[PDB]
Design a protein around this ligand. Structure first.
Ligand SMILES: [Cl-]
Lengths: 120, 120
C-alpha cells in the first residue's frame, strides 16, 4: 500500500478503504483514521512541532515546556525540553463509527513521526 | 454517571451519559472508546483466553511458553505467556474505527480482575 515506519511508529495509507484509509501506530497501539481526521492531524502536529522548534531555542538547561493545540476533533499536547518532546493526542468521538481514542508517542520517536507526516 | 477502575498501566471507564461509545479501555500510552456490543464480546473473549491459559499454565515448566489466539468478530485477541505471566494483543476490526492495543505481563491480571468486577 503506502507505508512509512520505524522503531516505535508507523503510518500506513490503504487506498482500497473507502473510509478508514489511514493507520497511525505507536509501540503498543494503532488506530485507523478517516481522510478528514488525517488531514487535520497532520496540520495540528506540524504547527505544534514548528511552534516547539522555534521556542526551544530560548530554553535554558532542562527547563521544560508544555504546549497544546486544539483543532476539532483533535487535542494535541506536547511536553518537552530543549532536547526532545513527547506528544499525546486526544481524538474526540464523532458519529456512529468514529470512536474516540487517545494515543501517544514518546521523546525522539516524535521527530521521526513528524518527518514521515511532512513527506506525506 | 461514571465508573472507573485504574492502576499502573491500565484503566477501564464506563460513562452512562454516552449513547454509543460508553466504555473506555486504556493502557499506558493509549485508550480507545468502545460501544456496548464491543465491550460485551471483549470481556467474553478475554475471560475465555484467561481461563484457558490458567489451565495450560500448570503444565508449563521452566521457560516453556504458550500462544493462544481467539477471534470472535469484531475482536481478535492474542495471548502470549509462560508460567509467570502473560501479555495480550487485541485487534478490533472496522464499520466502527479499527484499532490495535496491547497490555503487558502482570498488568493483564489487573485488567482481568477489573473486567470481572465492573458492577462489583
Ligand atoms: Cl457516544
Amino acid at each position: 500500500m503506502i507505508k512509512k515506519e520505524g522503531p516505535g511508529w508507523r503510518i500506513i495509507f490503504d487506498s482500497s478503504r473507502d473510509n478508514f484509509s489511514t493507520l497511525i501506530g505507536g509501540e503498543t497501539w494503532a488506530i485507523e483514521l478517516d481522510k478528514s481526521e488525517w488531514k487535520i492531524l497532520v496540520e495540528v502536529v506540524m504547527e505544534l512541532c514548528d511552534q516547539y522548534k522555534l521556542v526551544k531555542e530560548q530554553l535554558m538547561g532542562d527547563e521544560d515546556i508544555t504546549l497544546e493545540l486544539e483543532r476539532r476533533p483533535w487535542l494535541a499536547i506536547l511536553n518537552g525540553d530543549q532536547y526532545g518532546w513527547n506528544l499525546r493526542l486526544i481524538l474526540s468521538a464523532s458519529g456512529l463509527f468514529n470512536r474516540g481514542a487517545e494515543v501517544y508517542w514518546p521523546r525522539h520517536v516524535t521527530n521521526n513521526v513528524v518527518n514521515a507526516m511532512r513527506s506525506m
